[PDB]
Curated annotation (Swiss-Prot):
Residue positions, PTM Phosphoserine: 163, 170
SUPFAM superfamilies: Carbonic anhydrase
InterPro entries to which the protein is assigned, alphabetical: CA_dom (IPR001148), CA_dom_sf (IPR036398), Carbonic_anhydrase_a-class (IPR023561), Carbonic_anhydrase_a-class_CS (IPR018338)
Family: Belongs to the alpha-carbonic anhydrase family.
Cofactor note: Zinc. Can also use cobalt(II) with lower efficiency, but not copper(II), nickel(II) and manganese(II).
Site feature (Involved in the binding of some activators, including histamine and L-histidine) residues: 90
Effect seen on changing residue 60 to T: Reduced activity
Name of the protein: Carbonic anhydrase 2
Domain Alpha-carbonic anhydrase per the UniProt entry, residue ranges: 1-257
CC cofactor: Zn(2+); Co(2+)
More about this protein: Target of drugs used in treatments against glaucoma disorder and breast cancer.
Organism: Homo sapiens (Human)
Disease: Osteopetrosis, autosomal recessive 3: A rare genetic disease characterized by abnormally dense bone, due to defective resorption of immature bone. Osteopetrosis occurs in two forms: a severe autosomal recessive form occurring in utero, infancy, or childhood, and a benign autosomal dominant form occurring in adolescence or adulthood. Recessive osteopetrosis commonly manifests in early infancy with macrocephaly, feeding difficulties, evolving blindness and deafness, bone marrow failure, severe anemia, and hepatosplenomegaly.
pH-activity relationship: Optimum pH is 6-8.
């Protein structure tokens, strides 16, 4: 039936309905830190989220998305390998059933407990819909989450999760500041890729931060209490909603740091 992360509709099945699954620039990929090359042509990365307007949080049966108002440039990503301005539309996470797995991208094969994706679209293309029809339509800022100390800026998300336990549920989630989810350093790796979930469109410039943010065991645990299924259907814990590393093929990963 519908794609998912189960044994019969998981990552290894997606190619049947979404051929691009075996394309040339699929994500995520393993980040070989030694093979990644520092790039001088990379302009300073700019993350301007002070005017961010969060609107709501929703369970789409695959993960939960915190959406933002992107009708105006309020939260934009610029600089780095990007040409132009990209507006934040939503962010979500990917996590595992255990602390030892969960991230989509990996660093020297190392898997983190989870991974944060802040999705942005290129303003030159008018809307998100048109942006996903362009090779450079999107820019996703990926941040790894390791288990350790609690991340203050993530608790507001964690505490609202009970109100959107099942697929289809959503709740007002205004005045949330995404800056509270950013690590100290902005050092990153970047490469051309795709969405990590169907339709797996290859319209993404990936920017993955090197420094992980640390979250508490209890914060991650609450992520695992969510449900893939709908309210009246049998319970299936929302865990391991990540796609494994895909072939890098003809691509190079650039580092913004030497
Ligand atoms: N417009 C547009 C786009 F959004 C994406 C891709 S693509 O990602 O390179 N190729 C695929 N086109 N459809 C695909 S799917 N979901 O496998 O059927 S992905 C090509 C074009 Cl031309
Ligand atoms: N066409 C199209 C698209 F390319 C993407 C999304 S989306 O759900 O908002 N975006 C996400 N889908 N995958 C994500 S990931 N894990 O960041 O690569 S972002 C929805 C539609 Cl309808
Ligand atoms: Zn994602």
């Amino acid at each position: 039936h519908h794609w998912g992360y189960g044994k019969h509709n998981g990552p290894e099945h997606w190619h049947k309905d979404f051929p691009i699954a075996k394309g040339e620039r699929q994500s995520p990929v393993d980040i070989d830190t030694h093979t990644a090359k520092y790039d001088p042509s990379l302009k300073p990365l700019s993350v301007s989220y002070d005017q961010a307007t969060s609107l709501r949080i929703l369970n789409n049966g695959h993960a939960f998305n915190v959406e933002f108002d992107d009708s105006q440039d309020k939260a934009v990503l610029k600089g780095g390998p990007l040409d132009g301005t990209y507006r934040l539309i939503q962010f979500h996470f990917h996590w595992g059933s255990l602390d030892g797995q969960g991230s989509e991208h990996t660093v020297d094969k190392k898997k983190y407990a989870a991974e944060l994706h802040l999705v942005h679209w290129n303003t030159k293309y008018g809307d998100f819909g048109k942006a996903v029809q362009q090779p450079d339509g999107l820019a996703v800022l990926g941040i790894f989450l390791k288990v350790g100390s609690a991340k203050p800026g993530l608790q507001k998300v964690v505490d609202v999760l009970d109100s959107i336990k099942t697929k289809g549920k959503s709740a007002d989630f205004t005045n949330f500041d995404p800056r509270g989810l950013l690590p100290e350093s902005l050092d990153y790796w970047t490469y051309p890729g795709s969405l990590t979930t169907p339709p797996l469109l290859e319209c993404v410039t990936w920017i993955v931060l090197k420094e992980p943010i640390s979250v508490s065991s209890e914060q991650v645990l609450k992520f695992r209490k969510l449900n893939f299924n709908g309210e009246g259907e049998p319970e299936e814990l929302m865990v391991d909603n990540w796609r494994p590393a895909q072939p890098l093929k003809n691509r190079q990963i650039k580092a913004s740091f030497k």
